[PDB]
Coordinates of C-alpha atoms and ligand atoms in Angstrom, one line a residue:
Chain A
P279 CA 7.1 -1.0 -27.2
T280 CA 3.5 0.0 -28.1
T281 CA 2.7 3.1 -25.8
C282 CA 6.1 4.2 -25.5
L283 CA 5.7 7.6 -28.3
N284 CA 2.4 7.9 -27.4
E285 CA 4.3 8.9 -23.6
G286 CA 7.1 10.7 -25.5
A287 CA 4.3 12.4 -27.2
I288 CA 3.1 14.0 -24.7
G289 CA 5.9 14.9 -23.1
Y290 CA 7.7 16.9 -26.0
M291 CA 4.0 18.9 -26.6
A292 CA 4.7 20.2 -22.8
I293 CA 8.3 21.3 -23.8
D294 CA 6.7 23.0 -26.5
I295 CA 4.3 24.7 -24.8
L296 CA 6.9 25.6 -21.6
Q297 CA 9.5 26.8 -23.9
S298 CA 6.9 28.9 -26.7
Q299 CA 6.6 30.7 -22.5
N300 CA 10.4 31.5 -22.0
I301 CA 10.0 29.0 -19.0
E302 CA 13.2 27.1 -17.5
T303 CA 12.2 25.9 -14.0
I304 CA 9.7 23.6 -12.7
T305 CA 8.5 23.0 -8.7
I306 CA 8.5 19.0 -7.6
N307 CA 7.8 18.9 -4.0
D308 CA 9.8 21.6 -2.6
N309 CA 13.0 21.1 -5.5
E310 CA 14.1 23.4 -8.6
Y311 CA 14.8 21.0 -11.9
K312 CA 15.5 23.3 -14.3
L313 CA 15.0 22.2 -18.0
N314 CA 16.7 20.7 -20.7
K315 CA 16.4 22.8 -24.4
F316 CA 15.5 20.9 -27.4
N317 CA 16.2 22.8 -31.2
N318 CA 13.5 20.6 -33.0
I319 CA 11.8 16.5 -32.6
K320 CA 14.1 14.5 -33.7
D321 CA 16.4 16.2 -31.5
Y322 CA 14.1 15.4 -28.2
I323 CA 13.2 11.9 -29.3
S324 CA 16.9 11.5 -30.2
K325 CA 17.8 12.4 -26.3
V326 CA 14.7 11.0 -24.5
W327 CA 13.5 7.7 -26.4
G328 CA 16.4 4.4 -26.2
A329 CA 15.4 3.2 -29.2
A330 CA 15.7 6.3 -31.3
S331 CA 19.2 5.5 -33.2
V332 CA 17.6 2.0 -33.9
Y333 CA 14.4 3.0 -36.2
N334 CA 15.0 6.5 -37.3
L335 CA 11.7 7.6 -37.7
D336 CA 10.2 11.2 -39.2
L337 CA 7.8 12.2 -37.0
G338 CA 5.7 15.6 -37.4
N339 CA 4.0 17.3 -35.3
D340 CA 1.0 15.2 -35.8
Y341 CA 1.3 13.6 -32.5
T342 CA -1.2 11.5 -32.3
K343 CA 0.9 9.0 -35.4
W344 CA 3.8 9.1 -34.0
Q345 CA 3.3 5.7 -32.4
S346 CA 1.3 4.8 -36.2
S347 CA 5.2 5.2 -36.9
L348 CA 7.2 2.6 -34.9
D349 CA 3.3 0.9 -35.3
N350 CA 4.1 0.1 -39.4
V351 CA 7.8 -0.6 -38.9
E352 CA 6.5 -3.7 -36.0
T353 CA 3.6 -5.0 -37.9
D354 CA 3.1 -8.1 -36.2
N355 CA 5.3 -7.6 -32.9
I356 CA 2.8 -4.7 -31.9
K357 CA -0.6 -6.7 -31.8
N358 CA 1.3 -10.1 -30.6
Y359 CA 3.3 -8.4 -28.0
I360 CA -0.3 -6.7 -26.5
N361 CA -1.8 -10.0 -26.6
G362 CA 1.0 -11.8 -25.5
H363 CA 1.7 -13.7 -22.5
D364 CA 4.8 -15.1 -19.8
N365 CA 4.9 -18.9 -19.7
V366 CA 1.9 -20.2 -16.4
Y367 CA 3.1 -22.3 -14.1
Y368 CA 1.0 -24.2 -11.4
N369 CA 1.5 -25.8 -8.2
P370 CA -1.5 -28.0 -7.6
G371 CA -0.3 -30.1 -4.5
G372 CA 3.0 -30.6 -4.4
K373 CA 6.0 -30.4 -4.2
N374 CA 6.5 -29.5 -7.8
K375 CA 5.8 -27.1 -10.2
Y376 CA 4.4 -28.0 -14.2
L377 CA 4.3 -25.4 -17.1
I378 CA 0.2 -25.3 -17.5
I379 CA -0.2 -22.8 -20.1
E380 CA 3.2 -21.5 -22.8
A381 CA 3.9 -18.5 -23.0
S382 CA 3.4 -16.4 -26.8
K383 CA 5.8 -16.4 -29.2
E384 CA 9.3 -14.6 -29.1
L385 CA 9.2 -11.4 -30.5
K386 CA 12.4 -10.2 -32.7
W387 CA 12.5 -6.1 -32.6
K388 CA 14.5 -4.0 -34.8
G389 CA 18.3 -4.1 -33.5
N390 CA 17.2 -7.1 -31.7
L391 CA 16.0 -4.7 -28.5
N392 CA 15.1 -4.9 -25.9
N393 CA 11.8 -4.2 -24.0
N394 CA 13.7 -2.0 -21.6
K395 CA 15.1 0.5 -24.9
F396 CA 11.6 1.3 -25.4
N397 CA 11.5 3.3 -22.3
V398 CA 11.1 7.0 -22.9
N399 CA 13.5 8.9 -20.1
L400 CA 11.0 11.2 -18.5
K401 CA 14.0 12.2 -16.2
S402 CA 15.9 13.6 -19.4
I403 CA 13.7 16.4 -19.5
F404 CA 15.8 18.0 -17.2
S405 CA 19.6 18.7 -16.5
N406 CA 19.8 17.5 -12.6
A407 CA 16.9 14.6 -12.3
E408 CA 19.2 12.7 -11.1
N409 CA 17.9 14.7 -7.4
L410 CA 14.6 13.3 -8.3
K411 CA 11.9 11.0 -6.4
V412 CA 9.3 11.2 -8.7
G413 CA 8.9 7.6 -11.2
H414 CA 7.8 7.7 -14.6
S415 CA 3.5 7.4 -14.6
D416 CA 3.8 10.8 -11.8
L417 CA 6.2 12.0 -14.8
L418 CA 3.9 11.5 -17.2
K419 CA 0.9 12.7 -15.2
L420 CA 3.3 16.0 -15.0
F421 CA 3.7 17.1 -18.3
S422 CA 0.4 15.2 -19.3
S423 CA -1.0 18.6 -16.8
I424 CA 1.2 21.3 -18.2
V425 CA -0.6 20.6 -21.9
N426 CA -4.0 20.4 -19.8
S427 CA -3.4 24.2 -18.5
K428 CA -1.4 25.7 -20.9
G429 CA -2.6 23.6 -23.8
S430 CA -4.9 25.2 -26.8
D431 CA -8.1 24.0 -27.1
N432 CA -6.7 21.7 -29.7
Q433 CA -3.5 20.3 -28.4
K434 CA -6.1 19.5 -25.5
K435 CA -8.2 17.1 -28.0
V436 CA -4.0 15.6 -29.2
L437 CA -3.5 14.8 -25.8
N438 CA -6.4 13.2 -24.5
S439 CA -6.5 10.5 -27.8
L440 CA -3.1 9.8 -27.1
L441 CA -3.8 9.8 -22.7
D442 CA -6.4 6.7 -24.5
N443 CA -4.0 5.7 -27.0
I444 CA -1.9 4.6 -23.8
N445 CA -4.8 3.3 -21.4
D446 CA -6.1 0.9 -24.7
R447 CA -2.7 -0.7 -25.1
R448 CA -1.7 -0.9 -21.5
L449 CA -4.6 -2.8 -20.1
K450 CA -5.1 -4.7 -22.7
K451 CA -1.6 -5.9 -22.5
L452 CA -2.0 -6.2 -18.2
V453 CA -5.6 -8.2 -18.9
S454 CA -3.7 -10.8 -21.6
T455 CA -0.6 -11.3 -20.0
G456 CA -3.4 -12.2 -16.8
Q457 CA -1.4 -9.6 -13.9
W458 CA -5.1 -7.9 -14.1
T459 CA -6.2 -10.0 -10.6
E460 CA -2.9 -8.9 -8.8
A461 CA -4.7 -5.2 -9.7
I462 CA -7.7 -5.0 -8.6
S463 CA -9.9 -5.7 -5.7
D464 CA -10.3 -9.2 -4.6
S465 CA -13.2 -9.0 -5.0
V466 CA -14.4 -7.1 -7.8
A467 CA -12.1 -10.4 -9.7
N468 CA -14.3 -12.9 -8.4
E469 CA -17.5 -10.9 -9.7
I470 CA -15.7 -10.5 -12.6
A471 CA -14.8 -14.7 -12.9
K472 CA -17.7 -15.7 -11.6
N473 CA -19.4 -13.2 -15.2
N474 CA -16.2 -14.7 -17.6
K475 CA -16.4 -18.7 -16.4
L476 CA -12.5 -18.1 -15.5
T477 CA -11.2 -20.4 -12.6
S478 CA -9.6 -18.8 -9.9
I479 CA -5.8 -20.4 -9.5
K480 CA -2.6 -20.0 -7.5
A481 CA 0.4 -19.5 -10.0
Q482 CA 4.2 -18.5 -11.4
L483 CA 4.2 -15.6 -14.0
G484 CA 7.3 -16.2 -15.3
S485 CA 10.0 -15.7 -12.3
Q486 CA 7.6 -13.8 -10.6
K487 CA 6.5 -14.2 -7.2
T488 CA 3.2 -17.1 -6.9
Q489 CA 0.1 -14.5 -7.0
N490 CA -3.2 -15.0 -8.4
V491 CA -4.0 -15.7 -11.8
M492 CA -7.6 -16.3 -13.7
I493 CA -7.9 -18.8 -16.4
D494 CA -10.3 -20.2 -18.7
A495 CA -10.1 -23.8 -18.0
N496 CA -11.9 -25.1 -21.6
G497 CA -14.5 -27.2 -19.5
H498 CA -11.7 -29.1 -17.7
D499 CA -11.7 -30.4 -14.1
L500 CA -8.4 -28.6 -12.6
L501 CA -9.4 -31.8 -9.7
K502 CA -9.3 -34.1 -12.2
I503 CA -6.1 -33.7 -14.2
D504 CA -2.5 -36.0 -14.0
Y505 CA -0.3 -33.2 -13.9
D506 CA 2.4 -35.5 -14.0
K507 CA 1.2 -37.4 -17.1
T508 CA 0.2 -34.1 -18.7
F509 CA 2.7 -31.3 -18.2
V510 CA 6.3 -30.5 -18.2
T511 CA 7.0 -29.6 -14.4
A512 CA 9.6 -26.4 -14.2
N513 CA 12.8 -28.0 -12.2
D514 CA 12.5 -30.6 -15.9
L515 CA 12.8 -27.3 -17.9
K516 CA 16.0 -26.8 -16.5
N517 CA 17.4 -29.7 -17.5
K518 CA 16.1 -29.8 -20.6
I519 CA 14.6 -32.3 -20.9
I520 CA 11.3 -31.8 -22.1
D521 CA 8.6 -34.4 -24.1
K522 CA 6.7 -32.7 -26.7
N523 CA 3.5 -34.0 -25.7
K524 CA 3.6 -32.9 -22.1
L525 CA 5.3 -29.5 -23.4
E526 CA 2.3 -29.3 -26.8
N527 CA -0.3 -29.9 -23.8
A528 CA 0.4 -26.2 -22.4
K529 CA -0.8 -24.9 -26.0
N530 CA -4.2 -26.5 -26.4
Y531 CA -5.3 -27.1 -22.3
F532 CA -5.6 -23.9 -21.1
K533 CA -5.9 -20.1 -22.2
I534 CA -6.0 -16.3 -20.6
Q535 CA -8.8 -14.4 -21.4
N536 CA -8.5 -11.0 -23.2
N537 CA -11.2 -11.4 -25.5
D538 CA -13.7 -8.2 -26.0
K539 CA -16.1 -9.1 -23.0
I540 CA -13.7 -9.3 -20.3
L541 CA -11.2 -6.1 -21.6
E542 CA -14.6 -4.0 -21.8
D543 CA -15.8 -6.1 -17.8
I544 CA -12.5 -5.0 -16.3
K545 CA -11.8 -1.6 -17.8
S546 CA -15.1 -0.3 -16.6
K547 CA -14.2 -1.2 -13.1
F548 CA -10.5 -1.4 -13.0
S549 CA -10.1 2.1 -12.3
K550 CA -12.1 2.3 -9.2
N551 CA -10.9 -0.8 -7.9
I552 CA -6.9 -0.9 -7.3
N553 CA -5.8 -3.3 -4.7
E554 CA -5.0 -1.2 -1.1
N555 CA -1.7 -3.1 -1.1
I556 CA 0.2 -3.9 -4.3
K557 CA 3.7 -2.3 -5.3
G558 CA 6.6 -3.9 -8.0
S559 CA 6.3 -3.8 -11.7
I560 CA 2.9 -3.9 -11.4
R561 CA 1.4 -0.8 -9.6
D562 CA 3.4 1.5 -11.9
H563 CA 1.4 -0.3 -15.2
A564 CA -1.5 0.3 -12.4
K565 CA -0.4 3.7 -12.0
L566 CA -0.7 4.4 -15.3
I567 CA -4.1 3.0 -16.6
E568 CA -5.7 4.7 -13.6
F569 CA -4.4 8.6 -14.7
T570 CA -5.6 7.8 -18.6
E571 CA -8.1 5.8 -17.7
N572 CA -9.8 8.7 -14.8
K573 CA -7.5 12.0 -16.1
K574 CA -7.9 14.0 -12.8
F575 CA -4.4 16.2 -13.4
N576 CA -2.2 17.9 -12.1
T577 CA -3.0 21.2 -10.7
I578 CA -0.3 24.1 -12.2
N579 CA 0.9 27.3 -10.8
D580 CA 2.1 29.8 -12.0
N581 CA 5.1 31.5 -10.6
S582 CA 4.8 35.3 -10.5
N583 CA 8.3 37.7 -11.3
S584 CA 14.8 40.3 -14.5
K585 CA 12.4 37.0 -14.5
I586 CA 13.2 33.5 -15.1
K587 CA 10.2 31.7 -15.1
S588 CA 8.9 28.6 -13.9
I589 CA 5.4 27.1 -12.8
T590 CA 5.2 25.0 -9.9
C591 CA 3.4 21.0 -9.4
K592 CA 2.7 18.4 -6.4
Chain B
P257 CA 0.2 -2.2 28.0
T258 CA -3.7 0.2 27.9
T259 CA -5.7 -1.4 25.4
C260 CA -4.7 -4.7 25.3
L261 CA -6.7 -6.5 28.5
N262 CA -9.7 -5.0 26.3
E263 CA -9.0 -6.9 23.8
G264 CA -7.6 -10.5 25.8
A265 CA -11.4 -10.0 27.4
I266 CA -12.9 -9.7 23.2
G267 CA -10.8 -13.4 22.5
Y268 CA -12.1 -14.2 25.6
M269 CA -15.5 -14.1 24.5
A270 CA -15.8 -15.9 21.8
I271 CA -14.2 -19.0 22.7
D272 CA -15.9 -18.5 25.7
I273 CA -19.3 -18.8 23.1
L274 CA -17.4 -21.1 20.9
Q275 CA -17.0 -23.8 23.4
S276 CA -20.0 -23.1 24.5
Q277 CA -21.3 -24.5 21.4
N278 CA -18.7 -27.6 21.0
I279 CA -17.3 -26.2 18.3
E280 CA -13.6 -26.9 17.5
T281 CA -12.4 -25.7 14.0
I282 CA -12.9 -21.6 12.1
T283 CA -12.3 -21.7 8.7
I284 CA -9.7 -18.6 7.0
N285 CA -9.1 -17.9 3.6
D286 CA -10.4 -21.4 2.9
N287 CA -8.2 -22.8 5.8
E288 CA -9.3 -24.9 8.7
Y289 CA -7.4 -24.3 12.3
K290 CA -8.3 -25.9 15.9
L291 CA -9.2 -24.0 18.9
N292 CA -6.8 -24.3 22.2
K293 CA -8.8 -25.3 24.7
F294 CA -9.3 -23.0 28.0
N295 CA -9.7 -23.9 31.5
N296 CA -11.4 -20.9 32.7
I297 CA -10.0 -17.2 32.0
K298 CA -6.4 -17.8 34.1
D299 CA -5.9 -20.6 32.0
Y300 CA -6.7 -18.4 28.5
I301 CA -4.7 -15.5 30.0
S302 CA -1.7 -17.2 31.1
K303 CA -1.7 -18.3 27.4
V304 CA -2.9 -15.7 24.9
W305 CA -1.4 -12.3 27.2
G306 CA 2.9 -11.2 27.4
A307 CA 2.1 -9.6 30.4
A308 CA 0.3 -12.7 32.9
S309 CA 2.4 -14.2 34.8
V310 CA 4.6 -10.7 36.1
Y311 CA 1.3 -8.9 37.1
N312 CA -1.3 -11.9 38.4
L313 CA -4.4 -9.8 38.4
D314 CA -7.9 -11.7 39.2
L315 CA -10.3 -11.1 36.1
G316 CA -14.0 -11.4 36.5
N317 CA -16.5 -11.9 34.2
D318 CA -17.1 -8.0 34.0
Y319 CA -15.1 -8.0 31.1
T320 CA -14.8 -3.7 31.2
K321 CA -13.2 -4.3 34.2
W322 CA -10.2 -6.1 33.6
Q323 CA -8.4 -3.5 31.7
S324 CA -9.0 -1.3 34.6
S325 CA -7.4 -4.0 37.0
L326 CA -3.9 -3.1 35.2
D327 CA -5.3 0.0 35.6
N328 CA -4.9 0.2 38.8
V329 CA -1.5 -1.1 39.1
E330 CA 0.0 1.6 37.0
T331 CA -1.8 3.9 38.0
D332 CA 0.3 7.1 36.8
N333 CA 2.0 4.6 34.1
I334 CA -1.2 4.9 31.9
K335 CA -2.1 8.5 31.5
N336 CA 1.4 9.1 30.6
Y337 CA 1.6 6.4 28.1
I338 CA -0.5 7.3 26.4
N339 CA 0.0 11.1 26.4
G340 CA 3.6 10.4 25.7
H341 CA 5.9 10.8 22.6
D342 CA 9.6 10.5 21.7
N343 CA 12.5 12.2 20.5
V344 CA 11.9 14.6 17.9
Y345 CA 14.8 15.6 15.8
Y346 CA 14.9 17.9 13.4
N347 CA 17.1 19.1 11.1
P348 CA 16.7 22.2 9.8
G349 CA 19.7 22.8 6.6
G350 CA 21.9 20.0 6.4
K351 CA 24.0 18.4 7.6
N352 CA 23.7 18.0 11.6
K353 CA 20.2 17.4 13.1
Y354 CA 19.0 19.0 16.8
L355 CA 16.6 17.5 19.5
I356 CA 13.3 20.1 19.2
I357 CA 10.9 18.0 21.8
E358 CA 12.1 15.9 24.1
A359 CA 10.8 12.8 25.0
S360 CA 8.1 12.1 27.5
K361 CA 10.4 11.1 30.8
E362 CA 10.9 7.4 30.8
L363 CA 8.0 5.3 32.4
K364 CA 9.3 2.0 34.5
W365 CA 6.8 -0.8 34.4
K366 CA 5.6 -3.5 36.6
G367 CA 8.5 -6.2 36.4
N368 CA 10.5 -3.0 34.2
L369 CA 8.6 -4.8 31.5
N370 CA 8.5 -4.5 27.8
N371 CA 5.9 -3.3 25.0
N372 CA 6.2 -6.3 23.4
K373 CA 4.7 -8.2 26.9
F374 CA 2.2 -6.8 27.2
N375 CA 1.2 -8.2 23.7
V376 CA -1.9 -11.0 23.1
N377 CA -0.6 -12.9 21.1
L378 CA -4.9 -14.3 19.3
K379 CA -2.4 -17.1 17.2
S380 CA -2.1 -19.0 20.9
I381 CA -6.3 -19.5 20.4
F382 CA -4.4 -21.9 18.1
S383 CA -3.0 -25.2 17.9
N384 CA -1.7 -24.7 13.9
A385 CA -1.4 -21.3 13.6
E386 CA 2.5 -21.4 12.4
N387 CA 0.9 -21.5 8.6
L388 CA -1.5 -18.5 9.3
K389 CA -0.8 -15.2 8.2
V390 CA -3.3 -12.6 9.1
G391 CA -2.4 -9.5 11.4
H392 CA -3.3 -9.3 14.7
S393 CA -6.4 -6.3 14.4
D394 CA -7.8 -8.4 11.8
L395 CA -8.1 -12.0 13.7
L396 CA -9.6 -9.4 16.6
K397 CA -12.2 -8.5 14.0
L398 CA -12.3 -11.7 13.7
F399 CA -13.0 -12.9 16.8
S400 CA -15.1 -9.5 17.9
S401 CA -17.6 -10.6 14.8
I402 CA -18.3 -14.2 16.6
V403 CA -18.7 -12.4 20.0
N404 CA -21.5 -10.4 17.3
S405 CA -22.5 -12.9 15.8
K406 CA -23.3 -15.5 18.1
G407 CA -23.2 -13.5 21.7
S408 CA -25.8 -12.7 22.9
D409 CA -27.3 -8.8 24.1
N410 CA -25.3 -9.1 26.6
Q411 CA -22.6 -9.5 25.5
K412 CA -22.8 -7.9 22.6
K413 CA -23.0 -5.0 24.9
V414 CA -20.4 -5.8 26.9
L415 CA -18.0 -5.7 23.4
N416 CA -19.1 -2.4 22.4
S417 CA -17.6 -1.2 25.2
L418 CA -14.6 -2.7 25.1
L419 CA -14.0 -1.6 21.2
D420 CA -14.8 2.0 22.0
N421 CA -12.2 1.5 24.8
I422 CA -9.9 0.4 22.2
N423 CA -10.4 2.8 20.2
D424 CA -9.9 6.3 22.7
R425 CA -6.5 5.0 23.7
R426 CA -5.3 3.7 20.7
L427 CA -6.1 7.0 18.2
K428 CA -5.1 8.9 21.7
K429 CA -1.3 7.8 21.5
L430 CA -1.1 7.4 17.8
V431 CA -2.2 11.8 17.9
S432 CA 0.0 11.7 21.1
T433 CA 3.3 11.1 19.6
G434 CA 2.2 12.5 16.0
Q435 CA 1.8 9.2 13.9
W436 CA -1.6 10.2 13.5
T437 CA 0.3 11.9 9.9
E438 CA 1.6 9.2 8.3
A439 CA -1.7 7.0 8.9
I440 CA -3.5 9.5 7.0
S441 CA -3.6 11.6 3.8
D442 CA -1.9 14.4 3.0
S443 CA -4.7 16.6 1.9
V444 CA -6.7 15.9 5.5
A445 CA -2.8 16.2 7.4
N446 CA -2.5 19.5 5.9
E447 CA -6.8 20.2 6.9
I448 CA -6.3 19.8 10.2
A449 CA -3.3 20.7 10.7
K450 CA -4.3 23.9 9.2
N451 CA -7.5 24.1 11.0
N452 CA -5.4 23.3 14.1
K453 CA -2.6 26.2 13.2
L454 CA 0.4 23.3 13.6
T455 CA 3.4 23.9 11.6
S456 CA 4.9 20.8 8.7
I457 CA 8.1 20.0 9.1
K458 CA 10.0 17.1 8.7
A459 CA 11.8 14.8 11.8
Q460 CA 12.8 11.4 12.9
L461 CA 11.6 10.2 15.5
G462 CA 12.9 8.7 18.5
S463 CA 15.5 6.6 16.0
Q464 CA 12.4 6.0 13.1
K465 CA 13.7 6.5 8.9
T466 CA 12.6 10.2 8.4
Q467 CA 9.2 11.3 8.1
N468 CA 6.7 13.5 8.2
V469 CA 5.5 15.5 11.7
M470 CA 3.4 18.9 12.5
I471 CA 3.9 20.1 15.4
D472 CA 2.9 23.0 17.3
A473 CA 6.0 25.7 16.5
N474 CA 4.1 28.0 19.6
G475 CA 3.3 31.3 17.6
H476 CA 7.7 30.9 16.6
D477 CA 9.4 31.6 13.0
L478 CA 11.0 28.1 12.8
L479 CA 13.4 30.0 9.8
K480 CA 14.6 32.8 12.4
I481 CA 15.8 29.9 15.3
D482 CA 19.6 29.2 15.8
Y483 CA 19.2 25.7 16.3
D484 CA 23.0 25.4 17.0
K485 CA 22.4 28.3 20.0
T486 CA 19.2 26.7 21.3
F487 CA 19.4 23.0 20.9
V488 CA 21.3 19.8 21.6
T489 CA 22.6 17.8 18.4
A490 CA 21.5 13.8 18.3
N491 CA 25.5 13.4 17.7
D492 CA 25.2 14.8 21.4
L493 CA 22.1 14.2 23.3
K494 CA 23.9 10.1 21.9
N495 CA 27.4 10.7 24.1
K496 CA 25.6 12.5 26.7
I497 CA 27.0 15.8 26.4
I498 CA 24.7 17.8 27.3
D499 CA 23.5 21.7 27.6
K500 CA 21.5 22.1 30.8
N501 CA 20.0 25.2 28.6
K502 CA 19.4 23.4 25.2
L503 CA 18.2 20.6 27.3
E504 CA 15.8 22.8 28.8
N505 CA 15.0 24.6 24.8
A506 CA 13.7 21.1 23.9
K507 CA 10.7 21.4 27.1
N508 CA 9.5 24.5 26.4
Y509 CA 9.5 25.7 22.4
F510 CA 6.9 23.5 21.2
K511 CA 4.9 20.5 21.7
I512 CA 3.2 18.2 20.2
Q513 CA -0.5 18.9 19.7
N514 CA -3.1 15.7 21.3
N515 CA -5.5 18.4 23.2
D516 CA -9.1 17.9 22.4
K517 CA -9.7 19.9 19.6
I518 CA -7.4 18.2 17.8
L519 CA -8.2 14.6 18.6
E520 CA -11.9 15.4 18.2
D521 CA -10.6 16.6 14.0
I522 CA -8.7 13.0 13.6
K523 CA -11.5 11.7 14.9
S524 CA -14.1 12.2 12.9
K525 CA -11.3 11.9 9.5
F526 CA -9.3 9.4 10.4
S527 CA -11.3 6.0 9.6
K528 CA -12.7 6.9 6.3
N529 CA -8.7 8.7 5.5
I530 CA -6.0 5.8 5.8
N531 CA -3.3 6.6 4.2
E532 CA -2.8 4.7 0.3
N533 CA 0.9 4.5 1.4
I534 CA 1.4 2.6 4.8
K535 CA 3.3 -0.2 6.8
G536 CA 5.2 -0.4 10.0
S537 CA 4.6 -1.5 13.4
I538 CA 2.2 2.2 12.8
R539 CA 0.0 0.4 9.6
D540 CA -1.3 -2.6 12.2
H541 CA -2.3 0.8 14.9
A542 CA -4.7 2.3 11.8
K543 CA -6.3 -1.0 11.4
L544 CA -7.7 -0.8 14.6
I545 CA -8.5 2.2 15.1
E546 CA -10.4 2.0 11.5
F547 CA -11.9 -0.9 12.6
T548 CA -12.8 -0.2 16.2
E549 CA -14.2 3.1 15.1
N550 CA -16.5 2.1 11.8
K551 CA -17.6 -1.5 13.9
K552 CA -17.9 -3.6 10.2
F553 CA -18.0 -6.8 11.0
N554 CA -17.3 -9.6 9.2
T555 CA -20.0 -12.9 9.1
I556 CA -20.4 -15.5 10.0
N557 CA -21.5 -18.2 9.0
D558 CA -22.7 -22.2 9.7
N559 CA -21.4 -24.5 6.9
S560 CA -21.8 -27.6 9.3
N561 CA -24.5 -26.1 11.6
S562 CA -25.3 -27.3 14.5
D563 CA -24.9 -31.4 13.6
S564 CA -21.4 -32.7 12.5
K565 CA -19.0 -34.7 13.3
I566 CA -16.7 -31.7 13.9
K567 CA -18.5 -28.0 14.3
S568 CA -17.3 -25.3 12.2
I569 CA -17.4 -21.9 11.3
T570 CA -16.1 -19.8 8.1
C571 CA -14.4 -16.5 7.5
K572 CA -13.7 -13.5 5.3
Ligands
CL253 CL1 3.7 -1.6 -23.9
CL254 CL1 -0.9 1.2 24.0

């Protein structure tokens, strides 16, 4: 919701260059994909953005302002989303699971949209994408690479600012949600935890599988707390039996550490130290941050020849 | 089948060391595991080895000779297995699949055993193993680390030799089946193929799902071949409609390259360059090769030290 038009601008930027040079197909792996043709920005945005119908922004050729337009419309939702996190459950011994940190307030977007609708379908740039076996991040990497290769010097300056913008919000959301621990190596995670006075526990975020989470215990002994007395339990939430005092506790006992010091701390070591065994919703996020941070672009070749112009990638 | 007793000996040496020092538990991932107790070599092998009953070997305290014992029983099977590979199927255009390389001859082991039975079950060293979620290779590394940390010099010299034995055969088998490509990074895989005159195709090995395979095309143009005329088809081979000349063709057109040149080439670059995206039976095979080659042991600490009601050590 906060990096989508940043991505969209990069996708348009490549299309603007390719169409400008009469290039109609791209070679991904060993297949040829035929690019769609777009009249203007409104045409492209209408095609690749889910939420295009709802907002009706007016976007110029200043791509650094594309996200800002959305940012100004939704205002507080933008910062609140980036800093937001889910409900946190802790299983101290057995058999029950307790809500130790409550989720951030629910955000209502324009049109009562859903987080999926803000996605930009980089596959809609191709007419025959249905045959494509590439994920969103690599496609973003693909279009970003085209702008670096064929873009002007000023265009590359814009691409870099856009990539940088994606990294900042994407990483921050990852730290703020507590999901950063699962996305880097155990050794580095513990170093940052040691350095930042965080406590490592085994916890569940929303409906996700249990994972490694690091929380700020706020000068508390997690051994000494009575979870039955203090907190509500996940099965209790289902029964809609809720003790307000116990629910109130989830607000005040612990927090997820997202201040600038851990944020800087992780960013220095995040890029190098991604987990060997990772997959899922989280992996795309990790793929994205790594590329936008390091900026290792793919290579683009021009296919040479009554021509149809084309280019290849890996 | 060819490195199993090499692995078993490493496990016994650790048990021998730990028991010699009255140590009953190991700490793996903030957990405590209780070691089983073994009277002798036959007691341990009978418990951790699937095939112990079948062979009934007599194993001495020269552990480097443990594998040699099994090797003499099975003889030709050892070399044939290490160099063996499965059926290779190629889908040239669209809907049909052809046998382009025939599998090696069927091997019959003693008792007509199955390759799973040759496994050394390193969790059977612990009584409370069922909550343990650690793979075979990581366990071997754990026991190897114990032999390095607490073992005598003679024992450490044996361990180095045993590890070396495991590396050589496991890697050669990985090279011989054509599966090495899936266990390393694409660029390095492409590099070795280029240096070794290999052709990269998309192929299926046995009943496995499709993957990337590199074959020696023996100076052949895979574009110019008529697979329908030349080769049998996976459906045909399965149903036993077989053309004698076509099956013969699968013997002679291409080969899987496992000679020393490529073997050395892969051995130099394999350990550093394991594939980011890897899993299956193949991944454990890769971890094992990586560890035995590099030989970077874990750290073994005595927490409770020489004097305690229960003696223990920790790891990871
Ligand atoms: Cl986002
Ligand atoms: Cl083997």
